Design a binder for this molecule. Structure first.
Ligand code: A5J
Ligand code: MG
Ligand code: MG
Length: 522
DNA sequence: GACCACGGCGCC
DNA sequence: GGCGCCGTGGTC
């Protein structure tokens, strides 16, 4: 136990008042390096002395430092080491629980824990050349990028959504008071259980499905879809569900999350939260903003650009199909993208009996579910009742992947990111085949996730040069903010960085759009 | 108050 | 296939 400050290169531990770094109060700050722990008398002032956030959850402390106008980049983070060893290492509780430590709530102990866990995990990673490359060239630099992204935030049209809330509210009351009419009485329409009784016991409607854990009669949209004119109350419920979902999740909560000092909405990009290597967004999740329905697009317009700036949206086209062509090597699927063909449009045109010309974007979005559904083990049964109906060596790669997965316990992406799928030899078929679907999907979704992470690493410092910002990542999409006078060049540059991030056997192409709001930018 | 399981559902 | 957040119903 030594006096503050710590020497250069120590591991940091910190305690927040809450999980969100942009809203957190730094309750404590400590450091550790070689037999001693440096606890800070005043955590906020002690931030100015660190050159780097090195330790567990490094990005979170860096985001809080950017909130205070401090350039404190995140460095080594044992969480990132463990996540690359096994993507089920998602929390500091589990990592310490598994590699020799205990995740307490004292800054000093967290600094010493970060020191012990780094030495241990870094030891496990010796000889893992491809995972060390993913750590040095992707994940660790990415944590720095995501640090500035989270601290930047996005502009939100608050007064607009407040006005939209009143309009959506009264349209809800209409659908409700109606549902109560056909029901003959009032009840909590939000109550999943009360609805079941009204539908299947009082109205005697046929129960088409059962819930997973409690065996109750389901009221999901898919079930009600088959009842939407066996009775009229069903159609109103679906429209009621859609409205309350968007109002309670987006319209009302988001306006209340504008940050005092920045005046913008801030999310968190979790780097060790998925089994495939994707990022996740939380508090709030900005990777699930509505876009499907008209009302959803109304909400999407609330995401606007700063005055004098324009949003730039970039999105890889048919990304996982292009990745699939490279992973399998299918000459056909490879040649498909060499002719500039679009599978989502070709599938969407059989679905709706419409030529490729008049294929709207709502029926091609439906083709993605079909194409990617069919691709990853979709049963012939479920395909029937949603689109309303009664590539040779892809399979070769699937089996090669599953066989190798069974032999070594893990599948891997193009760059070597691993996911462990132990149930590939389970004796219960359903458990085995579910694991199989998880298994051969990971290399396709993870490679696409790798390319995107790697693109962000290469693009971000270029954006700093041009005075542009990186606002959001949506799996295979980037939302940037650039000054109006530079938006066009920024769009052309980012388009170029993303398409040539890591050449594949098929060209990567990116659709790009510019607009004052998120909807006009796509 | 907190946390939880569940059904349900928004997006990729 | 991969996520996170919703209200409800529930416990502590
Ligand atoms: N149901 C889905 N299932 C998936 O697995 C994806 C994965 C695979 C896909 O390539 C990737 C990015 O999604 P998207 O950008 O929306 O789809 P794509 O990149 O292939 O086609 P794009 O219109 O941009 O040319 O997420 C998406 C959907 N959407 O329903 O969406
Ligand atoms: Mg795409
Ligand atoms: Mg996309």
């Amino acid at each position: 136990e030594a006096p503050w400050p710590p020497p250069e290169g120590a591991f940091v531990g910190f305690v927040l008042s809450r999980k969100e770094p942009m809203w957190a109060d730094l309750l404590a700050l400590a450091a550790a390096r070689g037999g001693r722990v440096h606890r800070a008398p005043e955590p906020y002032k002690a931030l100015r002395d660190l050159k780097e956030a090195r330790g567990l959850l490094a990005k979170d402390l860096s985001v809080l430092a950017l909130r205070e106008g401090l350039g404190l980049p995140p460095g080594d983070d044992p969480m990132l080491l463990a996540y690359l060893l096994d993507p089920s290492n998602t929390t500091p509780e589990g990592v310490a629980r598994r590699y020799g430590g205990e995740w307490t709530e004292e800054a000093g102990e967290r600094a010493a824990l970060s020191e012990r866990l780094f030495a241990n995990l870094w030891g496990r990673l010796e000889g893992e050349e491809r995972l060390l490359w993913l750590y040095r060239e992707v994940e660790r630099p990415l944590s720095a990028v995501l640090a500035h992204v989270e601290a930047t935030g996005v502009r939100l049209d608050v007064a607009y959504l407040r006005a939209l809330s009143l309009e959506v509210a009264e349209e809800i009351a209409r659908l409700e008071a109606e549902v109560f009419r056909l029901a003959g009485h009032p009840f909590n329409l939000n109550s999943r259980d009360q609805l079941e009784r009204v539908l299947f016991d009082e109205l005697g409607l046929p129960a088409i499905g059962k819930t997973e854990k409690t065996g109750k009669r389901s009221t999901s949209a898919a079930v009600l879809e088959a009842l939407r004119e066996a009775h009229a109350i069903v159609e109103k419920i679906l429209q009621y569900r859609e409205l309350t979902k968007l109002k309670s999740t987006y319209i009302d909560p988001l306006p209340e999350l504008i940050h005092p000092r920045t005046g913008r909405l801030h999310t968190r990009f979790n780097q060790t939260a998925t089994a495939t290597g994707r990022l996740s967004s939380s508090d709030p999740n900005l990777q699930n903003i509505p876009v499907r329905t008209p009302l959803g697009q109304r909400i999407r317009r609330a995401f606007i650009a700063e005055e004098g700036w324009l949003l730039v949206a970039l999105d890889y086209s048919q990304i996982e199909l292009r990745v699939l062509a490279h992973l399998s090597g299918d000459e056909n699927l490879i040649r498909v993208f060499q002719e500039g063909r679009d599978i989502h449009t070709e599938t969407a045109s059989w679905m709706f009996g419409v030529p490729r010309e008049a294929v709207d974007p709502l029926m091609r979005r439906a083709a993605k579910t079909i194409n990617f559904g069919v691709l990853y083990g979709m049963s012939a049964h479920r395909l029937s009742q949603e689109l309303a109906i009664p590539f040779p060596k892809v399979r070769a790669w699937i089996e090669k992947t599953l066989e190798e997965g069974r032999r070594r316990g893990y599948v891997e992406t193009l760059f070597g990111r691993r996911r462990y799928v132990p149930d590939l030899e389970a004796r219960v078929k359903s458990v085995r085949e579910a694991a199989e679907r998880m298994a051969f999907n990971m290399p396709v979704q993870g490679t696409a996730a790798d390319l995107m992470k790697l693109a962000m690493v290469k693009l971000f410092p270029r954006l700093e040069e041009m005075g542009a910002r990186m606002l959001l990542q949506v799996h295979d999409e980037l939302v940037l903010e650039a000054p109006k006078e530079r938006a066009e060049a920024v769009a052309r540059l980012a388009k170029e960085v993303m398409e040539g991030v890591y050449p594949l056997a098929v060209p990567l192409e990116v659709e790009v759009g510019i607009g004052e709001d998120w909807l006009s930018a796509k």
